[PDB]
Every structure is written in structure tokens, then in C-alpha cells.
């Protein structure tokens, strides 16, 4: 089919793959128990992204949805990725600052709601109702971010300096990167249809690699993950 976005799906496959392999090799060599947990979680993240990026490349996870008088291409496979990857990233953050079980449950619950409503949105046929689901999803996201910013940061300042400092970086990457997703969806093929699907994929590829491989590099190279 040779769809124009394929190139970025192919580069995302390769970046996710390499990052998975690198983290696996590095994880395999660690014996510290606490470090191992971070390695497992953090290797699985780009691994999942890899599979989803590869699938999309090979033309799975793509469906046509009718709205605004057109058949719009929607990659639902991203949601299958983010369903598991986003809460895993939150888990890494939560274990870093030793967050309470209840906070974790709430964050993972809110995250499910973000991704589930984002997907309903993406698949909705009434143009205006697409944006209602988008709004509910953005809300859930903002809850998350609030918690990371106000709750976790506060928790991190009881910890050793390298733990507080590593957390702040990861928190800052997370806030900046995550906050861009809803904007992309809004202006792109799922929303207003302004940014073309080729460029939108580029944007999501950049954000995904940054949010998983970038995040992962900073986390796993830090001294904070040793118990
Ligand atoms: C590795 C992938 C990451 C870190 C993906 C993050 C995705 C989000 C923060 C998605 C947020 C969305 C909304 C807030 C509303 C509309 C739909 C979503 C799912 C793109
Ligand atoms: C009301 C949402 C505010 C989010 C702040 C996150 C840094
Ligand atoms: C404090 C580190 C800055 C990250 C911002 C761009 C991801
Ligand atoms: C992080 C995005 C907040 C809502 C959309 C603003 C254009
Ligand atoms: C104490 C956390 C409650 C979680 C329900 C979403
Ligand atoms: C950031 C998107 C700009 C591409 C042209 C609509």
C-alpha cells in the first residue's frame, strides 16, 4: 500500500527495537535486586511499543472511521501500546519515590480511563462527540500530571538527593512530552484534520521514542535505581 507515514512507523520500529535490546543487555548484567525491577519494567515498555510499531508498519491496527463527510484513517494500535506502556512508565516513577499502593491504583486507574476514553474518541462517528471523549481523556491526563507534580515531587524530597534529582528530570520529561499528545490528537487526523497523518505519525514517533527510550536511558543510567 505504501502509505506516506510508513517511513516513520519504520523508524519508530527500529528505535524502539534498538532501545529494547540495549536495555535487555544492560538489564541482564545487573544483580542488584531493586535495579532489576526498574530494568524489567523499563525494558518491557519499548518492547511493547516495538510490537505495535511493527504491526502498524505491516498494516495492522488501522481502521477507517467516518466523520466530517470523509473516511478518516485511525491507527487504533497506538492505544493497545499506550494501554500498557503509559501505566508502566507511571509505575517506574511510583517505585522511584516509593509511592503508596493507593496512589498507584489511582494513577493506573486514571491512566486506563485516559487511554480508554481516548480510544472511544478516536472511534466515534459523531464529529462533536469525538471532542467530548477527548476532553474527558485530557482531564484524566491532567489528574495524572497533577499527582506526579504535586504528590510525587513532595514524596521525592524525603529521599536521597540522587533519587530526588533523577525523579525531577523524569517528571519533567514526562510532563512536557505527555502534555503534547492531546494537542497532536486535537489538530491531527483524529481531531480537526489539520496536520496530515504523515506529519502526525512523525510527531507521535518523536514523542513515543522520547517518552520511552529517552526516559529509559535517563532512568537506567542513574544511581537512584539501586536499592
Ligand atoms: C509512550 C507513550 C506515551 C508516553 C503516550 C502518552 C499518551 C498520552 C499522554 C495520551 C493522551 C491522550 C489524551 C490526553 C486525550 C486524547 C487521546 C490521547 C490518548 C492521545
Ligand atoms: C489542573 C491540572 C494542572 C496540572 C499541573 C501539572 C504540572
Ligand atoms: C529537566 C529536563 C528537561 C526535559 C525537557 C524536555 C523533555
Ligand atoms: C496539555 C494539553 C491541555 C489541553 C489542550 C490545550 C490546547
Ligand atoms: C486509594 C486509591 C483509590 C483508587 C480507586 C480509583
Ligand atoms: C506542527 C504542525 C505543523 C504542520 C503544518 C500544518
UniProtKB/Swiss-Prot annotation:
GO terms for biological process: phototransduction; proton transmembrane transport. It is a multi-pass membrane protein. The modification N6-(retinylidene)lysine is found at residue 212. One of its GO terms (molecular function) is light-driven active monoatomic ion transmembrane transporter activity. Residues 26-39, 93-103, 151-168 are cytoplasmic. It is found in: Cell membrane. The record marks 81 as: Primary proton acceptor. Keywords: Cell membrane, Chromophore, Hydrogen ion transport, Ion transport, Membrane, Photoreceptor protein, Pyrrolidone carboxylic acid, Receptor, Retinal protein, Sensory transduction, Transmembrane, Transmembrane helix, Transport. The covalent binding of retinal to the apoprotein, bacterioopsin, generates bacteriorhodopsin. CDD domains: 7tm_bacteriorhodopsin. Homotrimer. This is Bacteriorhodopsin. It comes from Halobacterium salinarum (strain ATCC 700922 / JCM 11081 / NRC-1) (Halobacterium halobium).
Amino acid at each position: 500500500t505504501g502509505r506516506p507515514e510508513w517511513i516513520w512507523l519504520a523508524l519508530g520500529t527500529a528505535l524502539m527495537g534498538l532501545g529494547t535490546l540495549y536495555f535487555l543487555v544492560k538489564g541482564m548484567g545487573v544483580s542488584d535486586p531493586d535495579a532489576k525491577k526498574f530494568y524489567a519494567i523499563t525494558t518491557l515498555v519499548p518492547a511493547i511499543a516495538f510490537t505495535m510499531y511493527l504491526s502498524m508498519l505491516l498494516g495492522y491496527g488501522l481502521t477507517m472511521v467516518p466523520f466530517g463527510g470523509e473516511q478518516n484513517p485511525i491507527y487504533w494500535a497506538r492505544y493497545a501500546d499506550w494501554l500498557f506502556t503509559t501505566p508502566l512508565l507511571l509505575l517506574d516513577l511510583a517505585l522511584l519515590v516509593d509511592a503508596d499502593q493507593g496512589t498507584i491504583l489511582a494513577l493506573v486507574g486514571a491512566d486506563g480511563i485516559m487511554i480508554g476514553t481516548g480510544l472511544v474518541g478516536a472511534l466515534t462517528k459523531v464529529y462533536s462527540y469525538r471532542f467530548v471523549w477527548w476532553a474527558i481523556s485530557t482531564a484524566a491526563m491532567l489528574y495524572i500530571l497533577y499527582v506526579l507534580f504535586f504528590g510525587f515531587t513532595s514524596k521525592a524530597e524525603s529521599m536521597r538527593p540522587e533519587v530526588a534529582s533523577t525523579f525531577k528530570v523524569l517528571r519533567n520529561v514526562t510532563v512536557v512530552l505527555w502534555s503534547a499528545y492531546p494537542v497532536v490528537w486535537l489538530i491531527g487526523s483524529e481531531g480537526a484534520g489539520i496536520v496530515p497523518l504523515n506529519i502526525e505519525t512523525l510527531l507521535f514517533m518523536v514523542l513515543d521514542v522520547s517518552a520511552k527510550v529517552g526516559f529509559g536511558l535517563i532512568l537506567l543510567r542513574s544511581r537512584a535505581i539501586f536499592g
